[PDB]
Amino acid sequence: PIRLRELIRTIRTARTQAEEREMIQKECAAIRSSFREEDNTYRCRNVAKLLYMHMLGYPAHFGQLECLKLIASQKFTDKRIGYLGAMLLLDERQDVHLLMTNCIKNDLNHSTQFVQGLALCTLGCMGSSEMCRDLAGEVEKLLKTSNSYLRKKAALCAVHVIRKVPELMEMFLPATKNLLNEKNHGVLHTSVVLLTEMCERSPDMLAHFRKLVPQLVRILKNLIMSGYSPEHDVSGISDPFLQVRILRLLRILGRNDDDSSEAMNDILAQVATNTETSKNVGNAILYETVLTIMDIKSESGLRVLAINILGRFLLNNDKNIRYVALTSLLKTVQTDHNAVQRHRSTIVDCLKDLDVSIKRRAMELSFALVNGNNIRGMMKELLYFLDSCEPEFKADCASGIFLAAEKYAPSKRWHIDTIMRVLTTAGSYVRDDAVPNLIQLITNSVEMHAYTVQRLYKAILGDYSQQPLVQVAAWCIGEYGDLLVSGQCEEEEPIQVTEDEVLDILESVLISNMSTSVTRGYALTAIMKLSTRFTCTVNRIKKVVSIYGSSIDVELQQRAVEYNALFKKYDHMRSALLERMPVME
Amino acid sequence: DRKGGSYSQAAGSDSAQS
Amino acid sequence: SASAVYVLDLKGKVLICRNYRGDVDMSEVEHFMPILMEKEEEGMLSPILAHGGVRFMWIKHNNLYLVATSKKNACVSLVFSFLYKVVQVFSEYFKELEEESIRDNFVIIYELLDELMDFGYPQTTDSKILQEYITQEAPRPPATVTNAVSWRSEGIKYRKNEVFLDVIEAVNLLVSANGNVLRSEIVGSIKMRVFLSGMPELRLGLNDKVLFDNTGRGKSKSVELEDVKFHQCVRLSRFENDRTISFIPPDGEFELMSYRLNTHVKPLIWIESVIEKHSHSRIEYMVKAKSQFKRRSTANNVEIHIPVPNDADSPKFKTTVGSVKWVPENSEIVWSVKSFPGGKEYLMRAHFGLPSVEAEDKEGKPPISVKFEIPYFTTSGIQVRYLKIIEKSGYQALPWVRYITQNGDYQLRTQ
Amino acid sequence: EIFELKAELNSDKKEKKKEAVKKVIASMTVGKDVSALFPDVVNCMQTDNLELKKLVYLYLMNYAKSQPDMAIMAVNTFVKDCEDPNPLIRALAVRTMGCIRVDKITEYLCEPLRKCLKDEDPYVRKTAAVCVAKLHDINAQLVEDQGFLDTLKDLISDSNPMVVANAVAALSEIAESHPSSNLLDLNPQSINKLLTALNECTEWGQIFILDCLANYMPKDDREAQSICERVTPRLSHANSAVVLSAVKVLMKFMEMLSKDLDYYGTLLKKLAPPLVTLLSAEPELQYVALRNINLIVQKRPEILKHEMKVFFVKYNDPIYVKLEKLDIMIRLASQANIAQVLAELREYATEVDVDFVRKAVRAIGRCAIKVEQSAERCVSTLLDLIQTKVNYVVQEAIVVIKDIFRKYPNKYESVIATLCENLDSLDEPEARAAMIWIVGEYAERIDNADELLESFLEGFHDKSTQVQLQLLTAIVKLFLKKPTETQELVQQVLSLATQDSDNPDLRDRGYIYWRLLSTDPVAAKEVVLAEKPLISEETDLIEPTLLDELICYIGTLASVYHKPPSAFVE
Amino acid sequence: MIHFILLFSRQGKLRLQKWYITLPDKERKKITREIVQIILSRGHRTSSFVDWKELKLVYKRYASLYFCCAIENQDNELLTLEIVHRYVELLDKYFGNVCELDIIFNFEKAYFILDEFIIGGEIQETSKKIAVKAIEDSDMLQ
Amino acid sequence: KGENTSLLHP
């Protein structure tokens, strides 16, 4: 019977990773040998050692039946060890908790309070789709008990069952009725959490749960008045968890109704001025109250107070406070958007902050605050941020800039220029999925093609390693070869497009090692379309297609073979299937 | 004695090779 | 052409470093640990690291990684040879290769590192020569390094001239799971511990197949070594000219020649393995070992390692000859035998249960290897003719040598 | 601490000074910035004890770049120590002078370098050559002004063969960084003199001697034959680096050697035992040996034709060693050892390394594609791997089958039925696209091709661009071949890829397919379902220009990386 | 609710782990390694808030061993910090001068206290003395 | 060491 402390000391004495692994393997072998004999005297020490090994990163597949056997035992220590093993190494995907349903049901009616509480906690932590189905009746039976120490456990079990099985919430509607007068803080918190979970799961109970708004307001007022208490009073805030739950319920209660907002308007006003944010609990309570006011149909004064509190918290030097203020501003983007414009300087400064979370929050706030009038002004700031942004934020910044251009672009020419600049500067940071969106946007726009075609041609001959930019340039060339080069059928004066540089660039891209088989396919399609689109370079792409028909890639080889067959047998029919693709939103 | 084969005396050269 | 060679630790702390060229900053060693961690976590870890334009080649030592950062395209083979020479010198000077001696002999370690190489070019590599000029407990450099004979120090005086040879045989057999041997090569090892007076020049002579054919005696049992590597003191000119093994023996134990040729004979031990593993119920170990060696030869300290199940427990061994012990750390049962006479047949019957819950991932099938070592056996049949010990002063030498046969890469593929 | 150490160093007690020096060395080794105490230790520098002098020199070298201004108070001490009667002291002073990275320090050390250039002691000569090489590397102009090139060149034709090798290495290093103007190339007498001293050079000097021959280009068969004969004894050296250098020199000389002469055959015969010996070196050198063999394999592949057993990866071999062995076997695969390669691949497929399993599958596929005599064996191995019930193994087998179908699909119709129901639920794009292409191109031996493609059409619009293109191509091929059972399937695919497909290339392909179908369905068979030509497999052999350049650069970092020497240095 | 709460040392050793979401063992190990790398590669002025995988990865260690929490984006960030501080105070009261050595030896006691404090990622014991009394009574049972 | 130190120092 090796104790857990002895195993921990032995592990700490080991230095080499291989030596630690060997010691763990020896301990696991000893534990398996002890379990194979059906040992029950020193089962607690073996269970503790196995749990330590599993937490350390050791396999425990063979130590699954022992936990189940110890769960159905009678010793309190053995029962606790079995419950811990079931909670740690037992899960829905494990499939070993199916036999634990009978043990849980047997222990559900156990007279001991510690055993019943441990079983309820284990069921809540390892809730399964089928375990809750056979245990839903037991959870509802304990929800009507008068045990304060067990009321919270029953509420947690009911909440876990509802979360795992949303269809089982119908059986908890009458169980929680008339439970707003619980004196215990834990029981009241559990009831409030259960009511909030029921309201969030389905909106049918919102009307039924909205009648208790005056009771919740009275409870919150009584808690605020009783600001001194030995229990739940931390950092000068009494029942901070209860206050947070009440604020969350008020924010989620009556979010689209005037009566609910009006009833809690006085409570929200009192909390917004009767709470001190000097400590972390007070700041969290103020943030929760502001979020509830913003998410509910509160009064103009409440919205102004929330905006002032958010602005004050934004100037706070605390990183957590700044992150909370940024999150609140992002949440209150659509709501009070005009009032959020006063923090444009703060949002801009947050991008240069030395906090990754703070910088991300500032970037998100700037992206969400972009409108149809500040889009042009904010475009320069977004471009500067993308150019001098972190590697993990360059792609996100480029995506946000592209989304802003596609949603609130001041003009097609300005939006096209911004997209081209982003593609040129993004390089490998441009997402491949955004390539189809850019292609669709280019196809939809039929007024700016000569300038766009010239820009794409200029940006393509310079570099070709950018997969998204290269694909966009190839698509633009394929779509508007007839417009990029004018009068390029024969020899003419020296212009940007001579009808031969495009073919050479396409051939280099197709044969270049910097091809992922997607840009090469786009280049091949553009070359095939240029046979009818461009009448200057003819009789030369057919040889390349025939040579390109023996490519290593099966898809590329098939495409080359099809192109060669079309060029050699369907020369007159090449233009019959080269019509421009339709443009749709 | 010693494990791995007892030590044996060695000659100076192949006397049969002249 | 490493810029600087440093000695690391298991926790990433550099035990000792010594820059040789100065073209690589010493701060690059810190980034070596994260790069190694990333490579190990992704399987891309290699001994020759690359930190941008500077390559940090590292060798896994007993307790620390011998990281040798380099900047240009230096000779990788030369760097590896220098690292091996440094490791050998450290092993000769310090019997323990761990952090205990790294921080205990730094005063002499720095001097040895400075004297070993300068500007990235090694200069001193002889352990005896280094100990004769750098000691941990200084005179002018010895003339042996400056002289041509840097492997035999002159002026050595001994009461008796006794040389202990060792005919080490490595029997490596690669038997696949189908029962056929794929890689069957035996590598010879002629190591002699010469301890005499003066600097005698050994005149090695054995029953070599090439030598017998050249001399016209290619009719008896002659050893035809496919690859033969001479020692540093061995003159390659004589061997290339007429296979004359003439060289100055080193002062102490040294490897003169190391034969290496394929083996076309049957294995010394024939092991048949049976795996009667039930489906999560029990396991059977039908291991039968047959001694193919001569009955006059006994395999001392034979340890045939049979890999048992990773999750197997409660095993029972039913063998006839040799004790079987299951080591949980090794996750296998080794058929340890004290003395295994040739022609012996040992049969074993393993029986152990298995856990009800099946394993989440496979563990593989490691090959079964034996640790047999039967000395006084010459499987190759090569017989040493004579050892020409000649000294300027003139003395009667009494060289000795023993033939030892052991099991090297004798791995049998599992079913 | 610091004050106590400074007080101890500023004392007249030798034991206290030694203790302070040891404490400073321990602090510096432990990671303590002792550069601030360098000026204090400057006064306690000229000491009779050799142990204290070495520590002071090491501290100055490590505190020279940090405190270049404080290093100006050591020129007199270095000058005084450069004339020490003890050769060890002179060598240490020479090493410290070249190790000090001070621009103004090497200028005043030119006179000591010139004085020590003609040192009679071979160790002193080697130290002077090393200091000259270090000064040239730090300041090429200073070395040229001091005229150390003539002294370095004359050191080769002198005694102290280890000193000669050190000087030759220094001259090569100077020329290596030189722009090639005024090279130190020598005539055949110089090569003969180096070869004569090659047998007397040490292990380190042997590499330096062999490095000079790597740059010299033989011009006569007799000279090349003599060089090969001299380098032949180098292959029987226990030094792995020396053996590698000799092999590289022999390979370089074989470029001008005549195949008609028996010298090339003898060199090839004697090279195989050397390659076998090198293959059994230490794991660190195993990768280098594998890289060298791969580099020389493309030059003389017939040298190691019979070397196949040693290419097997050992059970205890490292992952890099196993990969190198697999690459060597793939490059050295032949029909004679086709069965052995197949057995090794099957055995290698049972390992627990996912990357190793993928590499083995790729090697097996490459061997099957390269040699058509083992196409049936490769197909059987792929079928066995698929039946082994391994997700990664199944994906590798599917990829191999798809590759073989595009390369050798003439006799690949017997595996369509087996591959038709082969746990096609895998969502891997590489295996899914290969299976779709196989079904589309081989939609003749499967009577349920439309039914199989029906399951893959549920998420065609959101599967992938390449996957969507492959599915569209397969649907088009099925419609062209058998449109009776796929008339509605083709229309559904066109509608999904034409209206619900926003991909530019995919949309263009769908529009082209729809236009071809609506223009001439008969012509689509000769246009879409045409007989593609032979697939040009990418050759793994390096370019002849790179192979010749890589032959000279043997044993360097570029050989392991398989990159040009100028493409890997910074 | 809290998806997963784990206490990890500065050197990377994990002293506690409690995940309320069923994930694969390999997936759970990878997530834990990523969380440790993010925490180990974060400065002291990062606000102790990280938005990793759409989860409020709040890291706040008062000693060499740090603690991490993963909650959904539906509640305030200060609530998680307050709950962590309350749990730390409760553990210190239950043990008395809690150190890294005692945490490893008292892994079972710490797990029992965490289970009795929060179940399923939600707060179960709002009071500080009632939970301690219940834990003491459960321990006295045997 | 740093492990025996109190988590909150109270």
From Swiss-Prot, chain A:
Widely expressed. Transmembrane segments: none annotated. Signal peptide: none annotated. Keywords: Coated pit, Cytoplasm, Cytoplasmic vesicle, Golgi apparatus, Membrane, Protein transport, Transport. It is found in: Golgi apparatus; Cytoplasmic vesicle, Clathrin-coated vesicle membrane; Cytoplasm; Cytoplasm, Perinuclear region. One of its GO terms (biological process) is platelet dense granule organization. It is a peripheral membrane protein. It comes from the Eukaryota. Its main location: Golgi. GO terms for cellular component: AP-1 adaptor complex; clathrin-coated pit; clathrin-coated vesicle; early endosome; lysosomal membrane; perinuclear region of cytoplasm; presynapse; trans-Golgi network. Belongs to the adaptor complexes large subunit family. Adaptor protein complex 1 (AP-1) is a heterotetramer composed of two large adaptins (gamma-type subunit AP1G1 and beta-type subunit AP1B1), a medium adaptin (mu-type subunit AP1M1 or AP1M2) and a small adaptin (sigma-type subunit AP1S1 or AP1S2 or AP1S3). Interacts (via GAE domain) with RABEP1. Interacts with EPS15. Interacts with SYNRG/gamma-synergin. Interacts (via GAE domain) with AP1AR (via coiled-coil domain). Interacts with CLN3 (via dileucine motif); this interaction facilitates lysosomal targeting. This is AP-1 complex subunit gamma-1. The gene is Ap1g1. The chain holds residues 4 to 588 of 822 of the full protein.
Curated annotation (Swiss-Prot), chain B:
It is found in: Cell membrane; Endoplasmic reticulum membrane. The modification Phosphotyrosine is found at residue 7. The modification Phosphoserine is found at residues 6, 12-13, 15. Induction: Up-regulated by IFNG, and pro-inflammatory cytokines IL1B and TNF. (Microbial infection) Polyubiquitinated in a post ER compartment by interaction with human herpesvirus 8 MIR1 protein. This targets the protein for rapid degradation via the ubiquitin system. Residues 2-18 are annotated as: Disordered. Residues 9-18 have a biased composition (Low complexity). Ubiquitous. The alpha-1 domain is a structural part of the peptide-binding cleft. Belongs to the MHC class I family. It is linked to Alleles A*02:01 and A*24:02 are associated with increased susceptibility to diabetes mellitus, insulin-dependent (IDDM). In a glucose-dependent way, allele A*02:01 may aberrantly present the signal peptide of preproinsulin (ALWGPDPAAA) on the surface of pancreatic beta cells to autoreactive CD8-positive T cells, potentially driving T-cell mediated cytotoxicity in pancreatic islets. Allele A*24:02 may present the signal peptide of preproinsulin (LWMRLLPLL) and contribute to acute pancreatic beta-cell destruction and early onset of IDDM. This is HLA class I histocompatibility antigen, A alpha chain. It comes from Homo sapiens. The lineage of its organism: Eukaryota, Metazoa, Chordata, Craniata, Vertebrata. The gene is HLA-A. The chain holds residues 338 to 355 of 365 of the full protein.
From Swiss-Prot, chain D:
One of its GO terms (cellular component) is AP-1 adaptor complex. One of its GO terms (biological process) is platelet dense granule organization. It comes from the Eukaryota. The modification N6-acetyllysine is found at residue 305. It is found in: Golgi apparatus; Cytoplasmic vesicle, Clathrin-coated vesicle membrane. Keywords: Acetylation, Cytoplasmic vesicle, Deafness, Disease variant, Golgi apparatus, Ichthyosis, Membrane, Nitration, Protein transport, Transport. GO terms for molecular function: clathrin binding; protein kinase binding. Widely expressed. Its main location: Golgi. It is a peripheral membrane protein. The modification 3'-nitrotyrosine is found at residue 561. Belongs to the adaptor complexes large subunit family. Adaptor protein complex 1 (AP-1) is a heterotetramer composed of two large adaptins (gamma-type subunit AP1G1 and beta-type subunit AP1B1), a medium adaptin (mu-type subunit AP1M1 or AP1M2) and a small adaptin (sigma-type subunit AP1S1 or AP1S2 or AP1S3). Subunit of clathrin-associated adaptor protein complex 1 that plays a role in protein sorting in the late-Golgi/trans-Golgi network (TGN) and/or endosomes. The AP complexes mediate both the recruitment of clathrin to membranes and the recognition of sorting signals within the cytosolic tails of transmembrane cargo molecules. This is AP-1 complex subunit beta-1.
From Swiss-Prot, chain E:
Gene3D superfamilies: 3.30.450.60. Widely expressed. It is found in: Golgi apparatus; Cytoplasmic vesicle membrane; Membrane, Clathrin-coated pit. Pfam families: Clat_adaptor_s. GO terms for molecular function: clathrin adaptor activity. One of its GO terms (cellular component) is Golgi membrane. It is a peripheral membrane protein. The keyword Lipid biosynthesis does not apply. It is linked to Psoriasis 15, pustular: A form of pustular psoriasis, a life-threatening disease defined by repeated flares of sudden onset consisting of diffuse erythematous skin eruption characterized by rapid coverage with pustules, high-grade fever, asthenia, marked leukocytosis, and elevated serum levels of C-reactive protein. Belongs to the adaptor complexes small subunit family. Subunit of clathrin-associated adaptor protein complex 1 that plays a role in protein sorting in the late-Golgi/trans-Golgi network (TGN) and/or endosomes. The AP complexes mediate both the recruitment of clathrin to membranes and the recognition of sorting signals within the cytosolic tails of transmembrane cargo molecules. Involved in TLR3 trafficking. This is AP-1 complex subunit sigma-3. It comes from Homo sapiens (Human).
